[PDB]
Swiss-Prot record, chain A:
Residues of the full protein shown: 57 to 261 of 906
Organism: Mus musculus
Keywords: Acetylation, Cell adhesion, Cell junction, Cell membrane, Cytoplasm, Cytoskeleton, Isopeptide bond, Membrane, Nucleus, Phosphoprotein, Ubl conjugation
Location relative to the cell: Cytoplasm, Cytoskeleton; Cell junction, Adherens junction; Cell membrane; Cell junction
Purpose: Associates with the cytoplasmic domain of a variety of cadherins. The association of catenins to cadherins produces a complex which is linked to the actin filament network, and which seems to be of primary importance for cadherins cell-adhesion properties. Can associate with both E- and N-cadherins. Originally believed to be a stable component of E-cadherin/catenin adhesion complexes and to mediate the linkage of cadherins to the actin cytoskeleton at adherens junctions.
Cross-linked residues, Glycyl lysine isopeptide (Lys-Gly) (interchain with G-Cter in SUMO2): 1
Disulfide bonds: none
GO BP annotations listed: apical junction assembly; apoptotic process; axon regeneration; cell motility; cellular response to indole-3-methanol; epithelial cell-cell adhesion; establishment or maintenance of cell polarity; extrinsic apoptotic signaling pathway in absence of ligand
Gene Ontology CC: acrosomal vesicle; actin cytoskeleton; adherens junction; catenin complex; flotillin complex; Golgi apparatus; intercalated disc; lamellipodium
PTMs per UniProt: Sumoylated. Phosphorylation seems to contribute to the strength of cell-cell adhesion rather than to the basic capacity for cell-cell adhesion.
Tissue: Expressed in cerebellum, heart, liver, small intestine, kidney and placenta (at protein level).
Interaction with JUP and CTNNB1: region residues: 41-92
Ranges for region Involved in homodimerization: 1-172
Membership in a protein family: Belongs to the vinculin/alpha-catenin family.
Protein's name in the database: Catenin alpha-1
UniProtKB/Swiss-Prot annotation, chain B:
Protein encoded by which gene: Ctnnb1
Family membership noted in the UniProt record: Belongs to the beta-catenin family.
Recorded superkingdom: Eukaryota
Primary role: Key downstream component of the canonical Wnt signaling pathway. In the absence of Wnt, forms a complex with AXIN1, AXIN2, APC, CSNK1A1 and GSK3B that promotes phosphorylation on N-terminal Ser and Thr residues and ubiquitination of CTNNB1 via BTRC and its subsequent degradation by the proteasome. In the presence of Wnt ligand, CTNNB1 is not ubiquitinated and accumulates in the nucleus, where it acts as a coactivator for transcription factors of the TCF/LEF family, leading to activate Wnt responsive genes. Also acts as a coactivator for other transcription factors, such as NR5A2.
Annotated protein name in UniProt: Catenin beta-1
Native organism taxonomy: Eukaryota, Metazoa, Chordata, Craniata, Vertebrata
Source species of the chain: Mus musculus (Mouse)
Disulfide bonds: none
Localization terms from the record: Cytoplasm; Nucleus; Cytoplasm, Cytoskeleton; Cell junction, Adherens junction
Modification type Phosphotyrosine: residues: 25
Record PTM: Phosphorylated by NEK2. EGF stimulates tyrosine phosphorylation. Phosphorylation by CDK2 regulates insulin internalization.
Tissue expression from the record: Expressed in cerebellar granule neurons (at protein level). Expressed in the intestinal epithelium (at protein level). Abundantly expressed in the tooth, skin, lung, kidney, eye and brain with weak expression in the liver and heart.
Amino acid sequence: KAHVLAASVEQATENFLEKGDKIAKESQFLKEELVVAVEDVRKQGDLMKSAAGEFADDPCSSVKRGNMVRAARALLSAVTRLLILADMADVYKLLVQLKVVEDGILKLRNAGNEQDLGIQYKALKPEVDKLNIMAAKRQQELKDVGNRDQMAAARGILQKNVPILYTASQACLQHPDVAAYKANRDLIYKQLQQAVTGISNAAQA
Amino acid sequence: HPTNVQRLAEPSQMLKHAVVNLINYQDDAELA
């Protein structure tokens, strides 16, 4: 009946590989690297299948038991390497979207007339929304309450200030000769950049 | 749209548990 236990390791290995194969195929980041990592999980997984099957067939053999334990170690090491790369891939995707928002904020800031300001605002709003969802999912995975709070705070500043930068820039365009509006626009822009760097650093902590 | 971490989380856990259970296997009746 020991095979009942070996079957479960096999079932779990296949289940894991199925998920890994899909992430490696669909990833826009670390694609080749994820593929190599999954290939090894598969390689070590098949070695474990053989070792576990031998152990289950001859439980008292200190040798077969030893081969199984070592094959188990190699398998779990490969699983760990895949998890690490999968996690990095998630971080890379978030950092790319953060850059999209950072570039969009600069464009909103510097629109040359109200017509373009409205367009750059419509261009930025959706990217902010997406970034937030992604950063929130990253926040729930952060283990340090410190980094988790920094992340929460940065997301809030970003969402609260995008609408305000639009209003600030609008005032600058409507009143070109008033220096105070430009100073306000720069102040809001600064708050936003600090949120951007906050998200960037918290995401990698 | 779950992250890669979420998609691999439970599967990885099930594999780790199954490996532990196989290693925990001992049955002295097998000796005979």
